[PDB]
Design an enzyme around this catalytic site. Sequence first.
Site, short mmCIF file in Angstrom:
data_model
loop_
_atom_site.label_atom_id
_atom_site.label_comp_id
_atom_site.label_asym_id
_atom_site.label_seq_id
_atom_site.Cartn_x
_atom_site.Cartn_y
_atom_site.Cartn_z
N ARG A 107 31.01 56.56 9.15
CA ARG A 107 32.20 57.12 9.83
C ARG A 107 33.49 56.80 9.03
NH1 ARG A 107 34.69 54.48 13.89
NH2 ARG A 107 32.67 53.71 14.67
N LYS A 120 34.42 77.81 5.59
CA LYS A 120 34.67 79.18 5.12
C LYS A 120 34.30 79.36 3.63
CE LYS A 120 35.52 79.35 9.17
NZ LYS A 120 36.34 78.17 9.55
N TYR A 149 46.15 79.77 13.46
CA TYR A 149 44.77 79.94 13.90
C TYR A 149 44.68 79.53 15.38
CZ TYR A 149 39.99 78.50 14.90
OH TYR A 149 38.78 78.29 15.53
N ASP A 191 47.68 74.50 5.50
CA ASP A 191 46.32 74.95 5.70
C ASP A 191 46.02 75.99 4.62
OD1 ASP A 191 44.35 75.95 8.63
OD2 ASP A 191 43.86 75.96 6.48
#
Lengths: 392, 392, 396, 392
Positions: free
Chosen positions: A55, A205, A108, A180
Amino acid sequence: LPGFATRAIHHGYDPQDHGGALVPPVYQTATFTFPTVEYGAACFAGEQAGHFYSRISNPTLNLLEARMASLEGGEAGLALASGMGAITSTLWTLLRPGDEVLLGNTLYGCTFAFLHHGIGEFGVKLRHVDMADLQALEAAMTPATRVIYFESPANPNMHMADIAGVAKIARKHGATVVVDNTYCTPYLQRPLELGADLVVHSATKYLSGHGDITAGIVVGSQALVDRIRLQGLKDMTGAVLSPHDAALLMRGIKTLNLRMDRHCANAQVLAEFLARQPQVELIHYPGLASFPQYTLARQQMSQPGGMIAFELKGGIGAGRRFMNALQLFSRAVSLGDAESLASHPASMTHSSYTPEERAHYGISEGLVRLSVGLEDIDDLLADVQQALKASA
Amino acid sequence: LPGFATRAIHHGYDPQDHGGALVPPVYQTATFTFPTVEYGAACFAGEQAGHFYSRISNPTLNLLEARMASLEGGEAGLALASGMGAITSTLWTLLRPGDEVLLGNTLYGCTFAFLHHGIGEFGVKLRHVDMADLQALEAAMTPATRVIYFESPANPNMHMADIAGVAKIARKHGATVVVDNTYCTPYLQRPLELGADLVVHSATKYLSGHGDITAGIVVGSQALVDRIRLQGLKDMTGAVLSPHDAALLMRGIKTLNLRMDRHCANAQVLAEFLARQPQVELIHYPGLASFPQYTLARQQMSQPGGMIAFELKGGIGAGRRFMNALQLFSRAVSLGDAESLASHPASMTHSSYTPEERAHYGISEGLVRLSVGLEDIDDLLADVQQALKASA
Amino acid sequence: GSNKLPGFATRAIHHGYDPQDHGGALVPPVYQTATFTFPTVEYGAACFAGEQAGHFYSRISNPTLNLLEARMASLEGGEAGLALASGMGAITSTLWTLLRPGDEVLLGNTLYGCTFAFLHHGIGEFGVKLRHVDMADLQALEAAMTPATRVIYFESPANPNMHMADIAGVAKIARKHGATVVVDNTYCTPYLQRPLELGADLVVHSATKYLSGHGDITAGIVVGSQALVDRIRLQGLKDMTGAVLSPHDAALLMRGIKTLNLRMDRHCANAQVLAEFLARQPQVELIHYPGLASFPQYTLARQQMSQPGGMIAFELKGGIGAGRRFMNALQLFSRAVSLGDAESLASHPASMTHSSYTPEERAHYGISEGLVRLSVGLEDIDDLLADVQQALKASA
Amino acid sequence: LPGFATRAIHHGYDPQDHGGALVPPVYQTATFTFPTVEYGAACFAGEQAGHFYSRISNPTLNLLEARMASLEGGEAGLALASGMGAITSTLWTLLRPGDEVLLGNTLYGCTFAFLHHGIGEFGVKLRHVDMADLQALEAAMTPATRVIYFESPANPNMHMADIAGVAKIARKHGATVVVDNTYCTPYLQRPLELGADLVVHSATKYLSGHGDITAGIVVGSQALVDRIRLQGLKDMTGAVLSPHDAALLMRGIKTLNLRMDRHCANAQVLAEFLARQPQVELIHYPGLASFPQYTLARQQMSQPGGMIAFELKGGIGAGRRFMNALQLFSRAVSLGDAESLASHPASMTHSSYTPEERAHYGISEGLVRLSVGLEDIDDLLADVQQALKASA
Ligand SMILES: Cc1ncc(COP(=O)(O)O)c(CN[C@@H](CCS)C(=O)O)c1O
Ligand SMILES: Cc1ncc(COP(=O)(O)O)c(CN[C@@H](CCS)C(=O)O)c1O
Ligand SMILES: N[C@@H](CCS)C(=O)O
């Protein structure tokens, strides 16, 4: 300095350090052991190169991170379970109650929702500014303004930001700029080299390229990324990327240059085709001469990208008939996959927005977004052609 | 109702719906396509049962979720990228500024850091209470108390709470009870069946059982889990679990009963051993008659678990030397793997606490925690034996 | 002291791996790589002719596969192991390296279908002599040994009627005549039976079954002496089969092996209870389970296998007709081939896993019509009982 | 008939048949169940088109097989654990003792070993013949000739066969023509369209493209492939391909066209460079006008490929020095990876051999072979350049 494709394949990895393995071994392990407790203490305290828990950190993830850092021209990278993992982990660590964040006019769907319905409801002030309008941004700045966050180009109407201009202003006020860069990727645009402090991606993506993983990336300064790792990720999101998914993402990045070239070349032909068509009202493609921000797009992006947005004469009715008639394009959300995808953002990707919020922030009525894939252009052309005939 | 072991292997899956496949195929896919845009619109609205995008929901993840819910005896489940992913996704969606959360006296370090340095810095009020002292809990309740969050047993000292007793008080005052059931698993303890509303796990631990994935689970009512999915996960953490990792979690879950039985039987023998050794000052194991809350342990847990905490007479120096001397046990954080693990917070993760908060919330400096694994008990005893001689 | 062998479960979790030699990773990293590179040309010279202990290509050898191998070797009590893409990969890679035209292989009376077909219709058509022998009859095995006999190959228990052989007795005969003994140990695993410790030269496994335990991979293992396993590696696998195991699948196999002892305990306890329930039933003609005193080789089973296993074979009264109605009525058991999965399976060898046999060959080599094979899984026993009970009712 | 790139992404898969999944779900399952034993008995007899066991057939492997069949223009495909898997399963099926196999003059090392030290020692006759020389091939045919097996290009190096000519000769004697098409891939050369009966591939190379799996493919007429599946694979090799690896192979195949274009363009540049250097005695690359079979190469291959072989003047000593000075190229056998690879057989794969043994096999003392990767060509040029200077 080796070229972009060379680093996408090789950076941060020498086979000689992993028994000669040409492909890095996948560290599908949750924890790491210590030779002494003294060694272990040192890992948690920060005063040692080494690992303890996936993590926080993992060598497969570290390679992905270093490699993405190199492609973006950043100092450090961080890998997360999703694009939303990247954005939330980033914004949760940089902002506190009483801070303000200036956003691009369009975001988005889930970014919008997170800002307004998520972190906005914990005492962080939101305000939307056109990030192409430098004097409107300067007027929006307050001493509370801690972060400037935007997408360029923006999901899903292709609105550009003046990253150099925004970052100039942000340096004066002591504001951190977060871009972004999902749509472009580091191959086409590198906001850190235009003065951004942090870039975030949905690696789901184009970076993955094949639609088989969900993942996120942050890249920026060592100091910002260390904070995002040790607070945002570790404590506030737990958006940990699977080592298995990180190796598929590294696998994807090895063809990023070739994939993006073909997305761009296919998208150019389809956009130019769509221009000459009687059923089409508008088109937002950065590589058309018609594109209102064509000049700004060329100073920042080396190619016009894989995404097309357009409206049909016929509006919402022709929208449905066009989409339902596609036989090779698939009706789905997402982008940047080998497969060609088509979507209607108001009912689907931006369905968190109400009908008023749709109109307020430039999201249209009969707007169809295309993510142009890697198929033979003639086949894509035939499919779009027959789908226009069916939309009458 | 089929037995626990039958449901851990079979629940929610009929091979006949997936081509006869005995093992469910892995839906390693980011997005899902639609046959029409009106079918797609219905999915985004909730009006149609179907899939669109894996961050929200995915069929491999849904099977894991359904199975875990059955095993916890609850209605719905959610899978996330980590235990911290489960906890943060949950609490971000349930709490807002001015809400109060009542916390167990001792919490896992990153949960503690999340609360005090994360969500508690966004205007959520926190108070720590001894969840075994029911009068003190009642006295601490306010009308602003929205959530009671605890672990039982709590790490690292194994302190217990009367879950049904806490649930009663929560029912009276109108609060939501969230229990971290990592240590026990649904096999030993089912807090939903004792009045709790939500249970969270680090599925990284016993549910996986093999140390190769990071993952989290939330189980509770459809109503609550739908909110955590659509707000906490979708917008606020993005802690998406990989389909690959979910498949490995399901694989681990199929031997859960068998592994826990061996974990518990090994830990019992080891605990009884440690209690008779001259180097041991104190020992905390639910299965020892000397355990403060032995009656409560036998009431609430069907077996005493695989985790031991003890203190050595010689303090931090002895703990260090004990830890360094282990040859079969590994020095590592984490727990519930096949491999036996030791951690001595005093010369490791003191645990992102202050020395004052350690001592105030109950984390000693002579204290070592053992996660007792699935190895042959004679080998484990011999390793512990020689490490105790070495401890002096 | 420290010269004590660690317990089976300890070795099944740890053997051959120290986290310190891989950056502290508790789980070994997966070498999902086709090829390996060399620091110098001269280091790569010594990897195609073994001066240097090093890697070049995953079809020959790979660190993830090597760990799996060293571990299976430890559990079987052999010197070396080899991992392959399937059980049939292990068997064919082994028999292709050991046999040449003119050699004879003596075979157990009953064999797994694809093994039977391989021998009769594959390697048997390339000049290798085959003869079947009852390997439980040590006098007959002795009588069948000829100077051309190179390999004695059998399963114990055999698939699917669970005929047994005396491995130690077979090996003693093989020591005297000079034959290599190859045992397929798929059914027992090294947890229940270790043929190398009883004198066999090689063991082979369908690791697809109990070793994996979860039905998600296909895999094989060969264990034996260093010299024989090296030969199998560099001839059978490299040149004659290319049955290379994916590192991903080898990782999953190692993962399953970590619970092999616990899974087998539960398989054996479930099957014992189920077999004793089935023995006391009106509809059952005969039940074959090594843990019932009625098992024809009860004492040999007790002698060689530490527990009676997870496989039951039985016949119903009503024959083949009643078989279909029983199997059709099952709702927790699945109708499927394979075995040693967490899921309980029921099948019909004559139309399924022994289809390679003609009607003639099924009756001659101990495969009846009406035989129902059960792979007893890890479900709660009351649920498995209830399902078999209701299915018996519907088979009347 | 859709284009190559379109079929490499889409052929044989509709997302609507699998709950909308854009990427096909991975059937990581050994066994398949039946709704009745009637249905089950039928699958084994061939009367019912279902699934039973993944060694025989698996949905994920079948999709790979149909797609490779389409790319090669064949009726049917078979996926196997390795290229040697595919070769051996093919040859064990088609040959029996007393049959003759006619072979190309030079073969891949392990193929040669299989033929001479494997199936050849079981009474199968071997004869090597120049497969470009039609009159010698016609002269070498006997009634025992059942298979004609060769690679084109081969590797002594890059020698080509007249595949259409070989096929014409084979049709006169009923013989089956098997071509190893590893080097070209179906993107560059389709031997089935030139009259071959079967093609084999080491999908470990270019088809995968990423160095992370071992896999084989056979493509051909239904009746031959069926027999190779049900005899070679099922009974004689057991070379079963993992569905995980088959999924990665399919992922690799979606960029095949783009990768091969770049492999070829880099290789053409390096060949042009190497052909003009003083250190280079001789070079074999199909794109150079000096290539002995340039015209034949261009009739069969749409592009000259990513492999180069060349000979240095300084012999074995200069060969070693060249190899050892490479910084970007790795010293490794194998080919078709994103990473550029070099081997010098005289000091590596054949160093145990004598200087006389290598000579008659067509292996010069200074023979170096390059698998030209996907890196930026300027970096590859710099690396080859300095290595050439070090070879003096
Ligand atoms: C620019 C941009 N930034 C972040 C995300 C979220 O990444 P994820 O968290 O990996 O889905 C996305 C995901 N949007 C997809 C589909 C997500 S429902 C779309 O635009 O259709 C994005 O487009
Ligand atoms: C004793 C024995 N020997 C070899 C095999 C073949 O292993 P695989 O090649 O991994 O299936 C097997 C696998 N048996 C399955 C195969 C399904 S046809 C069965 O009998 O149900 C076996 O049991
Ligand atoms: N709760 C586990 C892992 C977190 S680092 C532990 O404390 O060991």
